[PDB]
């Protein structure tokens, strides 16, 4: 049952459930209605018609991708902009890692999906090559199903804002989730610091700092504390998973050496050293807004 999507950031990333990864709430809400039900055809032969099992799967996956693309448009208040394109890219990528069996959330309806996929593709050493081949010949058609809703609504005015080549690019799930997390961080940060400058900006009297007495400014430092501590937590485990995944992988990704490389690619105006300060609570604006000293 594929429900309306929850408000962005209503539920922050989840590092407590699986303690080696932080799972975005978008992934938890990935539409998998048809992928979870799918049942066997009539055959009763020992070995079924796998070609037609894959065609059955394609249809089911196209329906779930279409619904996902519709709800992601509704989550964006029916705005066809770059934030919607990024979501389409992130969920297509997650569909892909589910199809290929390289998905990092192994919970609930995802384990059932994995058994449905094992009945179509088999389980021998080579089934993963087979699943990857079929994903690669299907992923652009799956992407087109995710764009069915925007396309249908805009009619004559539709234009290709989202780029097919970017969205179908295969890279490990952890790379894509860091990209998604970096964009979430960059939208929380200016919101979280301006919520400080409401209370701690300037100096009380002419010489004291407001945080050394003013209680409205101390509760604002206590909340930015809870937030930056989470961001720091989330960045640590995702970078750990990145390092674990990178050198446990042989398909190399020219241009990505560390997690910072990904944020630099993804974020305009990314500063590695200002970011390392921001999350370690040693950045310049946190000091003179929150530290007594």
């Amino acid at each position, epitope marked *: 049952n594929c429900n309306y999507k929850r408000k962005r950031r209503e539920r922050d990333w989840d590092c407590n459930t699986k303690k080696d990864v932080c799972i975005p709430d978008r992934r938890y809400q990935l539409c998998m209605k048809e992928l979870t039900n799918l049942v*066997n055809n009539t055959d009763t032969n*020992f070995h079924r018609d*796998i070609t037609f099992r894959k065609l059955y799967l394609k249809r089911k996956l196209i329906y779930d991708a279409a619904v996902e693309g519709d709800l992601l448009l509704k989550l964006n208040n029916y705005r066809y902009n770059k934030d919607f394109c990024k979501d389409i890219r992130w969920s297509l990528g997650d569909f892909g890692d589910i199809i290929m069996g390289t998905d990092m959330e192994g919970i609930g309806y995802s384990k059932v999906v994995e*058994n449905n996929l094992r009945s179509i593709f*088999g389980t*021998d*050493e080579k089934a993963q090559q087979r699943r990857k081949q079929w994903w690669n010949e299907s992923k652009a058609q799956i992407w087109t199903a995710m764009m069915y809703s925007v396309k249908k609504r805009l009619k004559g005015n539709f234009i290709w804002i989202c780029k097919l080549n970017v969205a179908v690019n295969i890279e490990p799930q952890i790379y894509r989730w860091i990209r998604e997390w970096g964009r979430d961080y960059v939208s929380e940060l200016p919101t979280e610091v301006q919520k400080l400058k409401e209370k701690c900006d300037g100096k009380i009297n002419y010489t004291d700092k407001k945080v050394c007495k003013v209680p409205p400014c101390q509760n604002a430092c206590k909340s930015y504390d809870q937030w930056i501590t989470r961001k720091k937590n989330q960045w640590d485990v995702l970078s750990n998973k990145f390092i674990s995944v990178k050198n446990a992988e042989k398909v190399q990704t020219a241009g990505i050496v560390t997690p910072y490389d990904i944020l630099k690619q993804e974020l305009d105006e990314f500063n590695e050293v200002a970011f390392e300060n921001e999350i370690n609570k040693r950045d310049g604006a946190y000091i003179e807004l929150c530290v007594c000293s």
Partner: antibody, heavy 123, light 108 residues
Framework: EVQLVQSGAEVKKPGESLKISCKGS????????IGWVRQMPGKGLEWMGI????????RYSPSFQGQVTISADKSISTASLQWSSLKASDTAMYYC????????????????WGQGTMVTVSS | IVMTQSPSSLSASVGDRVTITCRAS??????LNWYQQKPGKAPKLLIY???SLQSGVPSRFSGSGSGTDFTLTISSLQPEDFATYYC??????????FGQGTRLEIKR
């Protein structure tokens, strides 16, 4: 129709080389493992080895490792078994067979069999 | 993984019930198949996953067991059922092992 067709019976002298072949049709040849099985006259089935047609990953039984070479050619959907120098003890029927999986995908079995190639080795 | 079938030969008349056993040297759960072979014919997959019939196999065939002891039963032998039966562990995919076969002879 899904089929394995093996090459014709062979009569050879000791010391000759020989390659017998097995052609698949009616399915995606590169997606399945192909096994090879020996049956001496009047005896039972001996697994010899298996090959994945898609990338030529090859496993041999200990008893056939180094005695024989299993290979494959995807472009013509063929798996092969070859000896560099035959002995009279190689006289036997040889089967190829497709390994496939049940409706759950966990249980493998040999479901399509070639008709068998008889190889007779004598001086 | 060594597979031992027994008996190696069995005589019975049309109408009889017969039972063939197959022992595994270590547990293999239900990863056991059975094949039938008539003389000058290629083996035919008969049972898989210890007890599932292949299509077209008459219901008088059944397969039993899980772990190391496995059974093939023919509730009432038909003339076409006189053949050789092989078991085969499917536990170490794709490394295969067969049993040595049990031959059905017509008692008379």
């Amino acid at each position: 129709e899904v089929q394995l067709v093996q090459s014709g019976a062979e009569v050879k002298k000791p010391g000759e080389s020989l390659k017998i072949s097995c052609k698949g049709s009616g399915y995606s040849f590169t997606d399945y493992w192909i096994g090879w099985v020996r049956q001496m006259p009047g005896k039972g089935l001996e697994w010899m080895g298996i090959i994945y047609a898609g990338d030529s990953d090859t496993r041999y039984s200990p008893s056939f490792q180094g005695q024989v070479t299993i290979s494959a050619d995807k472009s013509i959907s063929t798996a092969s078994l070859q000896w560099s120098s035959l002995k009279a003890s190689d006289t036997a029927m040889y089967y190829c067979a497709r390994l496939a999986y049940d409706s759950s995908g966990y249980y493998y079995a040999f479901d399509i069999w070639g008709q068998g190639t008889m190889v007779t080795v004598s001086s | 993984i060594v597979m031992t079938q027994s008996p190696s030969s069995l005589s019975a008349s049309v109408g009889d019930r017969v039972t063939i056993t197959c022992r595994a040297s270590q547990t293999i759960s239900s990863y056991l198949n059975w094949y039938q072979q008539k003389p000058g014919k290629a083996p035919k997959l008969l049972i898989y996953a210890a007890s599932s019939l292949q299509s077209g196999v008459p219901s008088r065939f059944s397969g039993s067991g899980s772990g190391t002891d496995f059974t093939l039963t023919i509730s009432s032998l038909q003339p076409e059922d006189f053949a050789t039966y092989y078991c085969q562990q499917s536990y170490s995919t794709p490394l295969i092992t067969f049993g040595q076969g049990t031959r059905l002879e017509i008692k008379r």
